Amino acid sequence: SFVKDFKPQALGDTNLFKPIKIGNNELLHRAVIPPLTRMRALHPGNIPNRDWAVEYYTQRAQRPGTMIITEGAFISPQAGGYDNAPGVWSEEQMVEWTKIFNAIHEKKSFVWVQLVVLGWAAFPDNLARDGLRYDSASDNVFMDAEQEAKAKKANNPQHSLTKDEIKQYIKEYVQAAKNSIAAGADGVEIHSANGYLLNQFLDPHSNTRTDEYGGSIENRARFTLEVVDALVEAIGHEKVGLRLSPYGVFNSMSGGAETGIVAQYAYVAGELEKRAKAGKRLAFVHLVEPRVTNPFLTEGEGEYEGGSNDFVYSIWKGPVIRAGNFALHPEVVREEVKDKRTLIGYGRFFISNPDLVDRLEKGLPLNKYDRDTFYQMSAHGYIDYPTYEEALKLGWDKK
């Protein structure tokens, strides 16, 4: 059915429908698909779903000139720990990704691979089964008691990365980025958000290190910036973006309760702008808004009202993608896109509306999503959400 109480607004008269260039890509509008893990990849080997993934992305690529950021993709086995999320390290994986990228390009849209390392959010038992470590920045603070216990039970205690192991992850980020471009992707997004490994280094709750990778703002940002620099060198700044969630609490990050949190993220933004002014500007910075501090809470819940991401704009002068509870709030989007370098990521409602962009332009009702199938090994709740026309035929304008 359609979302019951929603009052749509046509946004076609706003900058959401003005073209913009991101990296090498001429986008025709500024509604971006942010990275959305869907758990349809198949075990063993973290293989993109051979039955449905092409169709899923094809559907969501249907509006010409749409920027799509893929579901998070693990850069290596050690970076993973979820059996049904895909990787980008193996030939068997890239065969499937190639088909996906080709399909998106056939629809005249674009695709950026999000590169992921899980750190403490991984399942320590899956990792132990596969002979892999359970990694984080530190070894004396844990995501939650359950994760700490799963780790101990698996004889796979949380491990504070050595410098050599950080270097190994950086090598894997580089090779994953290369693999992505070679298979036909338009670029990559470095995931440094939502409490995964890089965010675990950025955040002083999760990073109690006393070496050069913790204990100060500069040190906590070191790993993220080393990945940025390694990928810029490998595939070019125009093919690299970075995702950050300054106010996020998901996966036991600090959020606004940490009084140094804005400084930590302002420092990262400043270092990106420094690189930009020196000739290597990232394609974009992608921010999760304080509107959504945890993306598994219903829209309107977990909103942090004590901070804004606007500070980033005083520092970083390139494109900014903002995501978090914008589908249900065209009135907010209307104001945000008045800034001419702002794009809007629409997550959950892109799950349920393959033709979301048309609906935003034209002020059409939105399909309700079904959170129960966000993660599921099924075509149902993945490729069977209808377009607006299909929904009319099903009688949804009267259900």
Ligand X SMILES: C=C(C)[C@@H]1CC=C(C)C(=O)C1
Ligand Y SMILES: Cc1cc2nc3c(=O)[nH]c(=O)nc-3n(C[C@H](O)[C@H](O)[C@H](O)COP(=O)(O)O)c2cc1C
Q: Which residues bind Cl ion (CB under 5 A)?
A: 82-83, 310, 313
Bridge partners of 114, per DSSP, are 189
Q: Round to whole Å and give the CA distance between 349 and 328.
A: 9
34 preceded by a cis bond (ω within 30 of 0): no
- Does 37 appear as a known binding residue? yes
346 torsion bin: left (phi>0), alpha (psi -120 to 50), beta (else): beta
DSSP state of 18: S
Using the rule CB under 6 A, give the single segment among 44-52, 261-269, 287-295, 380-388 that binds ligand Y: 287-295
User: Does residue 37 touch ligand X according to CB under 6 A?
Assistant: yes
Q: By C-beta, is 212 or 310 nearer to Cl ion?
A: 310
Cα separation, 90 vs 330, in Å, equals: 41
Q: 196, 247, 304, 382: which one is catalytic?
A: 196
Binding mask 250-269 for ligand X (x = CB under 6 A): x-------------------
Tell me the HSE value of 242 on the side-chain side, using a 13 A CA sphere: 29
Does 289 bind its own copies (CB under 8 A)? Our answer is no
85 lines the binding site for ligand X (CB under 6 A): yes
Residue 267 among known ligand-binding residues: no
Strands 110-116 and 284-288: unpaired
Q: Name the residue type at position 298.
A: T
Judged by CB under 6 A, the number of residues near ligand Y is 23
Q: Figure out which of the listed residues 14, 29, 34, 385 binds ligand Y, where binding follows CB under 6 A.
A: 34
Query: Of the ranges 47-55, 207-215, 301-309, 332-340, which one interacts with Na ion (CB under 5 A)?
Result: 47-55
Q: How far is the CB of 81 from Cl ion (least distance, A)?
A: 7
Note if 196 is an active site residue.
yes
- Residues 286, 321 contacting (CB under 8 angstroms): yes
Q: Does 307 bind its own copies (CB under 8 A)?
A: yes
* Residue 44: φ, ψ to 5°: -85, 160
Burial class (CB in 10 A: 0-12, 13-18, 19+), 398: exposed
CB of 248 to ligand X, least distance (A): 9
Write out the residues near ligand X by the rule CB under 6 A.
37, 72, 82, 85, 116, 194, 250, 295
Annotated binding-site residues read 37, 114, 191, 194, 243, 348, 375
